[PDB]
Design a protein around this ligand. Sequence first.
Ligand SMILES: CCN(CC)C(=O)CCC(=O)NCCCN(CCCNC(=O)CCC(=O)N(CC)CC)C(=O)CCC(=O)NCC#Cc1cn([C@H]2C[C@H](O)[C@@H](COP(=O)(O)OP(=O)(O)OP(=O)(O)O)O2)c(=O)[nH]c1=O
Ligand SMILES: [Mg+2]
Ligand SMILES: [Mg+2]
Length: 539
Amino acid sequence: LEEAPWPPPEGAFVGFVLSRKEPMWADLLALAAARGGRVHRAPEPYKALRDLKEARGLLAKDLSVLALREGLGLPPGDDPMLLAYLLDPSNTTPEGVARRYGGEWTEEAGERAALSERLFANLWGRLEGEERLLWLYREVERPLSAVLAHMEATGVRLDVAYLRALSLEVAEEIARLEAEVFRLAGHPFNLNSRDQLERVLFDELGLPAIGKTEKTGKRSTSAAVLEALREAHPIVEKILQYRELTKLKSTYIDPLPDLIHPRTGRLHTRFNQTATATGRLSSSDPNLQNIPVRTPLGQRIRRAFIAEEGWLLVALDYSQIELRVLAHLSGDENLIRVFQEGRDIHTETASWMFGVPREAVDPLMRRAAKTINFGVLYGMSAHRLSQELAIPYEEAQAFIERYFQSFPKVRAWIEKTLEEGRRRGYVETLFGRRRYVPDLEARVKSVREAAERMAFNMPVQGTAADLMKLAMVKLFPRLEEMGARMLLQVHDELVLEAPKERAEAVARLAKEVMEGVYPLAVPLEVEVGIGEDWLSAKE
DNA sequence: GACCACGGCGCC
DNA sequence: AAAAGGCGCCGTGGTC
Ligand SMILES: CCN(CC)C(=O)CCC(=O)NCCCN(CCCNC(=O)CCC(=O)N(CC)CC)C(=O)CCC(=O)NCC#Cc1cn([C@H]2C[C@H](O)[C@@H](COP(=O)(O)OP(=O)(O)OP(=O)(O)O)O2)c(=O)[nH]c1=O
Ligand SMILES: [Mg+2]
Ligand SMILES: [Mg+2]
């Protein structure tokens, strides 16, 4: 390409090199743009950012987040990553996409700019005639990248002092547990080492091994195994408590406080847009889509996520979203009727599980019940279910008969979906988002049937993901005009931040946007709460 | 210091 | 652990 002085003409593709992958933390080392057989290299990248109207090219969202961090309103535009991801969601990295569609991902901005231009041309070509994928690109993914950029640069407020204090308290409790574990073993060892624990439980103490690990066939010490052994030796309960506490402390309590950004004073995640097989987003660095919520200590941690002073958090969560999607995709009259009547399948199952009436099902019971509902829907075995519910195998097998019989046209949809996947080599969401599942023709049964479970889960999980993304795209500009903020997405949930005066109006508005995103054969219901912290906001 | 594979486990 | 699916991060163990 012909070397040409900065700045580039408008519509040029950008290339850029960060000192580290996280755009809120990165130094912009270099910046370039490419168009019309030219390549322009910015003498000083930060200053050159101001000359661009739009970030167009590979990882456009990351450069846009960096720009917002610097006070520049630079929105992301076309990104070949989004084109490739729609063509095949195993296209998750620029290294791979480059190799697959016409170049190499190097460490030089000018080369990355040229690459973006070339790859865009080629991938755009491949999407011609693919009208549904085109609609997903233009109406969903592309605008969604702009929304994600704002969410990332905005961040979420965290009560750091609270977490610091919590750490010291959990440390003492952890020591109480580990000391007792060592007393019971008769000697200390690295309790964090599942290999050392394996030998203590199964070789030294006389406990029966229950299961083996997947890759290396060691005797497993997983929570499920320990659960089954909870009454064979008092050390087992202590170990389970130890695991709970150390998991929460090492993953959330200790790391999160150290990740507060000096400029914003908030915590900033990344919402990865080309990272999953089904079309869901993922979150990393840190992952804010797996903040604890179940146990007492977990809830204490979620309480650390708080609203700016003068603001409130608003949490909105789609009700039984994948069951409703299933009703629509399958067209099952019984299931559709359930939602037209306003029934709650999770409460109902929770009612059967704990042997209480529906009004007796508390939040944590209902939670347990959804693991069972989706567990079964997506192929859980009779054997496993009996083990979890701690009931006879015959009771577990029975529950699964009744489950699929109540909703007769589901299996038809599953069989239709699997046959279709075998022929085309891929399955599809409602909107035509694709996932290739070649192992549907595998000759090994365990491999083939695992593939089948992935394949028929995908249209359901993926449609739910399409709906939520579309909702985010419609909702974002409405929040901007009300002076509220979109902060996080957790798959079928959004967390917004609104000024106190407008929080009620924002909650109502967001609820309606989410419910009316794309009407289905059953209503979509959204549960909404308002609060000073994330736990309170989910009520 | 960093990379991986693994087991394990937090959320949806 | 097991015929639920989708993720990312932790510490260990082994390298490099
Ligand atoms: C090989 C087979 N293998 C391997 C593992 C598996 O198949 C893998 C599965 C997996 O990887 N791990 C398994 C589950 C692990 N455990 C717990 C561990 C167990 N230890 C205890 O219980 C201890 C008890 C305890 O301490 N105490 C307190 C001390 C009490 C319990 C959790 O996830 C914990 C967290 C949790 O349950 N959070 C709920 C959940 C969930 C799921 C969601 N979805 C999809 C559809 C939904 O529609 C959509 C939206 O979700 P959501 O909005 O929520 O639901 P709805 O929209 O439908 O309903 P409403 O919005 O109306 O309410 O997402 C799934 O596909 N599967 C799901 O499980
Ligand atoms: Mg939900
Ligand atoms: Mg949810």
